[PDB]
Amino acid sequence: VKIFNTQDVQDFLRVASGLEQEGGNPRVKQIIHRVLSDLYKAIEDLNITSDEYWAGVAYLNQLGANQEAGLLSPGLGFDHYLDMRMDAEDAALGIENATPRTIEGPLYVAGAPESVGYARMDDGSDPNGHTLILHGTIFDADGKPLPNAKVEIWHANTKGFYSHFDPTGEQQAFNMRRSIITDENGQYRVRTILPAGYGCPPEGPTQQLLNQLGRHGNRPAHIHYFVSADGHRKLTTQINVAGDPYTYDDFAYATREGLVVDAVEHTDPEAIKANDVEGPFAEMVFDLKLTRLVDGVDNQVVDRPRLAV
Amino acid sequence: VKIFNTQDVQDFLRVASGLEQEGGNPRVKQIIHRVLSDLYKAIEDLNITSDEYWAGVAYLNQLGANQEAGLLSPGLGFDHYLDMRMDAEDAALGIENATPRTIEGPLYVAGAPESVGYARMDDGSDPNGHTLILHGTIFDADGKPLPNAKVEIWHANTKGFYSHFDPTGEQQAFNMRRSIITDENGQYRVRTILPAGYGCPPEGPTQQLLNQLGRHGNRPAHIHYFVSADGHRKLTTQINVAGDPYTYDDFAYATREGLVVDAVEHTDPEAIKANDVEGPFAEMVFDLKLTRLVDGVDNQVVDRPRLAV
Ligand SMILES: CCCCCCCCCCCCCCC(=O)OC[C@H](COP(=O)(O)OCC[N+](C)(C)C)OC(=O)CCCCCCCCC
Ligand SMILES: CCCCCCCCCCCCCCC(=O)OC[C@H](COP(=O)(O)OCC[N+](C)(C)C)OC(=O)CCCCCCCCC
Ligand SMILES: [Fe+3]
Ligand SMILES: [Fe+3]
Ligand SMILES: [Hg+2]
Ligand SMILES: [Hg+2]
Ligand SMILES: [Hg+2]
Ligand SMILES: [Hg+2]
Ligand SMILES: [Hg+2]
Ligand SMILES: [Hg+2]
Secondary structure, X not given: OOOOOOXXXXXXXXXXXXXXXXXXXXXXXXXXXXXXXXXXXXXXXXXXXXXXXXXXXHHHHHHHHOOOHHHHHHHOOHHHHHHHHHHHHHHHOOOOOOOOOOOOOOOOEEOOXXXXXXXXXXXXXXXXXOEEEEEEEEEOOOOOEOOOOEEEEEOOOOOOOOOOOOOOOOOOOOOOEEEXXXXXXXXXXXXXXXXXXXXXXXXXHHHHHHHHOOOOOOEOOEEEEEEEOOOEOOEEEEXXXXXXXXXXXXXXXXXXXXXXXXXXXXXXXXXXXXXXXXXXXXXXXXXXXXXXXXXXXXXXXXXXXXXXX | OOOOOOHHHHHHHHHHOOOOOOOOOHHHHHHHHHHHHHHHHHHHHOOOOHHHHHHHXXXXXXXXXXXXXXXHHHHOOHHHHHHHXXXXXXXXXXXXXXXXXXXOOOOOEEOOOEEEOEEEOOOOOOOOOOEEEEEEEEEOOOOOXXXXXXXXXXXXXXXXXOOOOOOOOXXXXXXXXXXXXXOOOOEEEEEEEOOXXXXXXOOOHHHHHHHHOOOOOOEOOEEEEEEEOOOEOOEEEEEEEOOOOOOOOOOOOOOOOXXXXXXXXXXXXXXXXXXXXXXXXXXXXXXXXXXXXXXXXXXXXXXXXXXXX
């Protein structure tokens, strides 16, 4: 069957998109028209049956009902595709951004407490939590320590859950979420625990689709970062814990060279006392170098819906 | 900045789609691969920003959260487009559709009370309800009256609300929903009330997207039909109440020539008595002609999620 290219279908696509209406947002109509066209065409080229179509419509309802659109998004590579575009654009402007950006993920929560230089991130409610001392220096576009920069960090516990999105409900507000303002040496230091990777809600729509593609929905253990400061663009990045089985097989394709960090294990008494911890702990060092604003503006900051508490 | 047609992105689409993956459903991979390719490309061609992208993702969540995917679908012309593909296929097979098909809509409910020849569809709970006597004849593929045919009818009240989907929740199950088995003369007859047209939930995602397209979301008063019988294909259609303002301006583009019917107003005491009514009533006559199975197969019956109570 071939009717997509006839005048009725073509005219119809213009009507449905409201390209004929006088009111509305021209930008939205432009996009809708393009998307309906490609889909109407895809339905023809692939001879998608009504049965298949409605299975797709039902899937769409499940996805939203389970608020998993922002989880399916990175799994189908959009999140990384948008980053790739951001990189292409910077490369075209001669911006040799040292610390590679990667996806933000849908689990950021605004409002975390902030402090200068140091902060313990966890409430110690994780029985299996392994103490982690994470620290580094923030450098400006010139390679100089940058005091006053705001480092935002958020990660999951050993069960792979983030505060505010813990299915088991446990967690205290902003647990494992802090904003650190760099100190006199442009440094930040936090005490938290090693996060574990995690997968998609096992019975959710995202996992359903992934099984159909013969793929897994697991992410390697990682820590999320937000770094902003005057005169510089906001940095969205993360670090992967070295040795994770999914380090290079992240379902969200967020991993990048330069972002995989080694968690050095310490067990000797001198190290333990020095960092005034209570037993063997792991240490990760990660410095971040920021890029300068582009003609006075942050050409790559993203404004997307983020939960605020 | 263009990266879509480079190797990296093209290989990325194959990976995200599970193409080189051994497990999974290749039909789904095929469709996903096509859809992703088109969306990645549309994003680049229309230079969609992350800000715009994430608003789209947010819309998808609320679309599903509100269980409105099946409502937007017809509003964006998919339901009708699929009917067109069906007509085209029937044409290619030489099947002359006497009674034109049209969209089912997302409001069908399975399990309605069943009766032979006659049925009263309402329970009187609608004040402004105006008595409507709808009756007709079902003809088999050879133009002869067909007894024991199953006619299913469903429609909204004067507030434009359907039972099972009534926000005010004052309707009893299956109100204005009935299955009628045709009598010895292949006839069906029901007593009900003239339905009112209806629109999209005003606060819902479908309505808001329609606003951005400068379109409305109203449908003219109509009555839905499902007609099935042994040896025949299941017919999905609906009749439009003549004179409705939106008759040829339905947001679901379901109106069709041959489906618009005139509600005759009867006020003579002799007619009111012959029809066992308590006063002035409206009458609508609509005969439907079925098509025979194709070699024992119903090549157009649609299997889609339908509420069953
Ligand atoms: C309002 C606008 C509407 C736009 C609609 C989108 C376009 C339509 C294309 C959708 C094509 C879907 C075809 C997939 C399919 O034919 O079947 C998909 C699987 C089913 O698996 P089966 O084993 O065959 O089920 C049956 C098992 N039995 C046989 C034992 C019963 O189920 C699933 O949920 C997977 C569905 C994934 C499709 C979602 C794509 C969205 C991504 C952006
Ligand atoms: C899981 C994978 C997901 C793949 C999805 C890819 C699609 C990406 C395209 C998204 C296009 C949306 C961009 C439109 C936009 O930038 O904003 C959309 C409107 C907002 O109104 P504004 O007035 O512009 O807000 C601004 C007010 N200010 C100016 C005062 C600030 O809101 C809306 O809901 C319209 C959004 C509807 C789009 C849904 C299409 C799906 C149907 C097939
Ligand atoms: Fe994460
Ligand atoms: Fe309807
Ligand atoms: Hg990449
Ligand atoms: Hg998973
Ligand atoms: Hg996942
Ligand atoms: Hg049409
Ligand atoms: Hg509406
Ligand atoms: Hg509507």
